[PDB]
Scaffold this motif. Structure first.
Motif, PDB file in Angstrom:
ATOM      1  N   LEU A   1      17.260  48.859  60.194  1.00 28.23           N
ATOM      2  CA  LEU A   1      17.912  48.062  61.232  1.00 28.23           C
ATOM      3  C   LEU A   1      19.176  48.733  61.766  1.00 28.23           C
ATOM      4  CD1 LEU A   1      17.484  44.544  59.611  1.00 28.23           C
ATOM      5  CD2 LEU A   1      16.613  45.241  61.937  1.00 28.23           C
ATOM      6  N   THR A   2      19.889  49.438  60.877  1.00 33.38           N
ATOM      7  CA  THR A   2      21.172  50.038  61.227  1.00 33.38           C
ATOM      8  C   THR A   2      21.064  51.518  61.601  1.00 33.38           C
ATOM      9  OG1 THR A   2      21.723  50.460  58.875  1.00 33.38           O
ATOM     10  CG2 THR A   2      22.459  48.415  59.877  1.00 33.38           C
ATOM     11  N   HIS A   3      19.844  52.044  61.621  1.00 32.69           N
ATOM     12  CA  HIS A   3      19.624  53.488  61.859  1.00 32.69           C
ATOM     13  C   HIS A   3      20.426  54.399  60.944  1.00 32.69           C
ATOM     14  CE1 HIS A   3      17.825  53.085  66.190  1.00 32.69           C
ATOM     15  NE2 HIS A   3      17.365  52.165  65.361  1.00 32.69           N
ATOM     16  N   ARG A   4      20.462  54.051  59.663  1.00 32.52           N
ATOM     17  CA  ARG A   4      21.097  54.854  58.633  1.00 32.52           C
ATOM     18  C   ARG A   4      20.022  55.559  57.817  1.00 32.52           C
ATOM     19  NH1 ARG A   4      25.306  54.753  61.603  1.00 32.52           N
ATOM     20  NH2 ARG A   4      27.173  53.764  60.707  1.00 32.52           N
ATOM     21  N   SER A   5      20.320  56.758  57.314  1.00 27.86           N
ATOM     22  CA  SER A   5      19.401  57.489  56.439  1.00 27.86           C
ATOM     23  C   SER A   5      19.068  56.629  55.249  1.00 27.86           C
ATOM     24  CB  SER A   5      20.038  58.781  55.915  1.00 27.86           C
ATOM     25  OG  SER A   5      20.162  59.735  56.948  1.00 27.86           O
ATOM     26  N   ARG A   6      20.116  56.167  54.588  1.00 32.05           N
ATOM     27  CA  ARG A   6      19.952  55.357  53.397  1.00 32.05           C
ATOM     28  C   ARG A   6      21.204  54.547  53.163  1.00 32.05           C
ATOM     29  N   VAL A   7      21.022  53.388  52.553  1.00 33.01           N
ATOM     30  CA  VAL A   7      22.126  52.575  52.113  1.00 33.01           C
ATOM     31  C   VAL A   7      21.806  52.119  50.698  1.00 33.01           C
ATOM     32  CG1 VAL A   7      22.437  51.780  54.502  1.00 33.01           C
ATOM     33  CG2 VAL A   7      21.195  50.344  52.816  1.00 33.01           C
ATOM     34  N   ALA A   8      22.815  51.609  50.000  1.00 34.22           N
ATOM     35  CA  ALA A   8      22.638  51.101  48.631  1.00 34.22           C
ATOM     36  C   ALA A   8      23.530  49.897  48.420  1.00 34.22           C
ATOM     37  CB  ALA A   8      22.981  52.190  47.605  1.00 34.22           C
ATOM     38  N   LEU A   9      23.165  49.022  47.492  1.00 31.27           N
ATOM     39  CA  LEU A   9      23.990  47.867  47.167  1.00 31.27           C
ATOM     40  C   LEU A   9      25.286  48.331  46.515  1.00 31.27           C
ATOM     41  CD1 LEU A   9      24.040  44.714  46.976  1.00 31.27           C
ATOM     42  CD2 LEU A   9      23.260  44.972  44.621  1.00 31.27           C
ATOM     43  N   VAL A  10      26.439  47.904  47.045  1.00 29.40           N
ATOM     44  CA  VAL A  10      27.742  48.315  46.507  1.00 29.40           C
ATOM     45  C   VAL A  10      28.563  47.115  46.009  1.00 29.40           C
ATOM     46  CG1 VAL A  10      27.878  50.483  47.802  1.00 29.40           C
ATOM     47  CG2 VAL A  10      28.810  48.341  48.877  1.00 29.40           C
ATOM     48  N   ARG A  11      28.339  45.936  46.580  1.00 26.99           N
ATOM     49  CA  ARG A  11      29.111  44.753  46.187  1.00 26.99           C
ATOM     50  C   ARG A  11      28.253  43.534  46.389  1.00 26.99           C
ATOM     51  NH1 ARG A  11      32.403  48.050  48.823  1.00 26.99           N
ATOM     52  NH2 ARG A  11      31.945  47.217  50.909  1.00 26.99           N
ATOM     53  N   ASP A  12      28.529  42.454  45.663  1.00 26.15           N
ATOM     54  CA  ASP A  12      27.856  41.198  45.975  1.00 26.15           C
ATOM     55  C   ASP A  12      28.748  39.988  45.647  1.00 26.15           C
ATOM     56  OD1 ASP A  12      27.330  39.833  43.496  1.00 26.15           O
ATOM     57  OD2 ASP A  12      25.993  41.522  43.017  1.00 26.15           O
ATOM     58  N   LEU A  13      28.365  38.806  46.100  1.00 25.18           N
ATOM     59  CA  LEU A  13      29.145  37.614  45.770  1.00 25.18           C
ATOM     60  C   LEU A  13      28.194  36.441  45.760  1.00 25.18           C
ATOM     61  CD1 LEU A  13      32.098  36.301  45.422  1.00 25.18           C
ATOM     62  CD2 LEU A  13      32.013  35.887  47.866  1.00 25.18           C
ATOM     63  N   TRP A  14      28.216  35.663  44.694  1.00 16.51           N
ATOM     64  CA  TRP A  14      27.391  34.466  44.641  1.00 16.51           C
ATOM     65  C   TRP A  14      28.217  33.319  45.200  1.00 16.51           C
ATOM     66  CZ3 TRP A  14      27.025  30.925  39.905  1.00 16.51           C
ATOM     67  CH2 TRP A  14      26.050  29.934  40.126  1.00 16.51           C
ATOM     68  N   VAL A  15      27.765  32.689  46.279  1.00 16.22           N
ATOM     69  CA  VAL A  15      28.623  31.720  46.981  1.00 16.22           C
ATOM     70  C   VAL A  15      27.968  30.334  47.015  1.00 16.22           C
ATOM     71  CG1 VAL A  15      29.774  33.458  48.437  1.00 16.22           C
ATOM     72  CG2 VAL A  15      27.688  32.342  49.222  1.00 16.22           C
ATOM     73  N   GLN A  16      28.801  29.301  46.917  1.00 11.96           N
ATOM     74  CA  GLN A  16      28.366  27.916  47.091  1.00 11.96           C
ATOM     75  C   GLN A  16      28.500  27.466  48.573  1.00 11.96           C
ATOM     76  OE1 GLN A  16      27.022  25.045  46.126  1.00 11.96           O
ATOM     77  NE2 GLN A  16      27.855  24.252  48.062  1.00 11.96           N
ATOM     78  N   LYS A  17      29.457  28.036  49.294  1.00  5.65           N
ATOM     79  CA  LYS A  17      29.788  27.605  50.666  1.00  5.65           C
ATOM     80  C   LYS A  17      29.912  28.823  51.583  1.00  5.65           C
ATOM     81  CE  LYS A  17      32.601  23.931  48.670  1.00  5.65           C
ATOM     82  NZ  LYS A  17      31.608  22.945  49.186  1.00  5.65           N
ATOM     83  N   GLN A  18      29.575  28.681  52.863  1.00  2.00           N
ATOM     84  CA  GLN A  18      29.563  29.855  53.736  1.00  2.00           C
ATOM     85  C   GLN A  18      30.972  30.369  54.025  1.00  2.00           C
ATOM     86  OE1 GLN A  18      27.669  28.625  57.636  1.00  2.00           O
ATOM     87  NE2 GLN A  18      29.563  29.566  58.400  1.00  2.00           N
ATOM     88  N   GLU A  19      31.972  29.506  53.848  1.00  4.76           N
ATOM     89  CA  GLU A  19      33.354  29.858  54.098  1.00  4.76           C
ATOM     90  C   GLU A  19      33.837  30.923  53.119  1.00  4.76           C
ATOM     91  OE1 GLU A  19      32.213  26.661  53.894  1.00  4.76           O
ATOM     92  OE2 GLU A  19      32.386  26.163  56.022  1.00  4.76           O
ATOM     93  N   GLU A  20      33.063  31.127  52.057  1.00  4.26           N
ATOM     94  CA  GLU A  20      33.449  32.045  50.984  1.00  4.26           C
ATOM     95  C   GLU A  20      33.064  33.477  51.351  1.00  4.26           C
ATOM     96  OE1 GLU A  20      31.519  29.992  47.748  1.00  4.26           O
ATOM     97  OE2 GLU A  20      33.366  28.965  47.150  1.00  4.26           O
TER      98      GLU A  20
END
Length: 140
Positions: free
Chosen positions: A71-90
């Motif tokens: 989608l982003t026209h990148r060679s490759r990407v990888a997961l670097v960070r994540d966050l488990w959220v209860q609310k979208q404001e987070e």
């Protein structure tokens, strides 16, 4: 079984035009609920992939990294960070190449939103009882 999932040119065009795209049934609903149940036990909400294998397993088996790069026209990407959220404001600003918001429970379990920059308003939300995980992908 699960069918193979393939992006269509019109999915690319939607993402190009708007900077996000929302997919129904992006990830298997049973894999999402299992992850959510493990997160509730694990109870800090940051980088939960360092604690549970289910995060990278979903990323890899649903090919979220390859789909984000496409989608982003990148060679490759990888997961670097994540966050488990209860609310979208987070979900705050992150400058990564592409984020994916994956809903883990409730009616919209398994729905995911690819986007870049700030979380887009009036595109996706979930009930107060439900949760989601934001996944940050980087070509760095």
């Amino acid at each position: 079984s699960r069918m193979r999932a393939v992006l269509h040119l019109e999915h690319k065009r939607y993402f190009q035009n708007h900077g996000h795209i929302l997919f129904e049934g992006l990830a298997p609903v049973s894999d999402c609920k299992q992850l959510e149940a493990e997160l509730k036990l694990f109870l800090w909400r940051e980088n939960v992939h360092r604690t549970l294998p289910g995060v990278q397993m979903i990323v890899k088996r649903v090919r979220l990294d390859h789909l984000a790069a496409e989608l982003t026209h990148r060679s490759r990407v990888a997961l670097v960070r994540d966050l488990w959220v209860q609310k979208q404001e987070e979900i705050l600003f992150d400058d990564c190449d592409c984020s994916v918001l994956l809903c883990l429970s409730g009616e919209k379990a398994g729905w995911g939103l690819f986007f870049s920059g700030e979380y887009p308003q009036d595109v996706f939300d979930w009930g107060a009882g439900d949760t989601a995980i934001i996944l940050r992908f980087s070509s760095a």
